[PDB]
């Protein structure tokens, strides 16, 4: 009906989907971390 409230926060979901461990469990995730490191991001991951 009305939209824009699509984000319904959960910390468990947050960290399971986007967290450090999740990023290191696959080669592609590691490439994400590597790219962010390259660009010099302050936060590599959630």
């Amino acid at each position: 009906k009305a939209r824009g409230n699509e984000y319904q926060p959960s910390n468990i979901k947050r960290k399971h989907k986007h967290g450090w461990v999740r990023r290191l469990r696959t080669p592609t995730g590691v490439q994400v971390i590597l790219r962010r490191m390259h660009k010099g991001r302050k936060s590599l991951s959630h």
Partner: protein, 122 residues
């Protein structure tokens, strides 16, 4: 958009998330579910008797400093093992096989406080 930057702390998550602030565990979980402390894991402070001793938190201003010599393994060798080794070589009683009388220790695993794997906190 949640919060990326702020650090991840036990205050932040659900009930199920408990992360200590870095104090060290004193025990384990027992049979009843109740927690058991192990008297050996709890650090025992060793405190000397200070009453009859004279030294103070500050030093007199006219008292001199000194030329600064960082202690080296060499100087420590010379203040300890060198007089004894010289005494027993001059007497010909020197034994290259066992240096143990001079204070050398072949292996650390026997003694209480070992230096290399570093058994003690402080």
């Amino acid at each position: 958009g949640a919060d990326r930057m702020s650090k991840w702390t036990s205050k932040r998550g659900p009930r199920t998330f408990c992360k200590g602030r870095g104090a060290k565990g004193t025990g384990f979980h027992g049979r009843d579910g109740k927690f058991v402390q192990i008297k050996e894991m709890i650090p025992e402070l060793v405190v000397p008797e200070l009453a009859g001793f004279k030294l103070k938190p500050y030093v007199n201003y006219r008292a001199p400093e000194g030329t600064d010599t960082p202690l080296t393994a060499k100087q420590l060798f010379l203040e300890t093992a060198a007089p004894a080794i010289e005494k027993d070589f001059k007497a010909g009683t020197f034994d290259p096989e066992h240096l143990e009388k001079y204070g050398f220790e072949p292996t650390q695993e026997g003694k209480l406080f070992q230096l290399y794997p570093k058994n003690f906190p402080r």
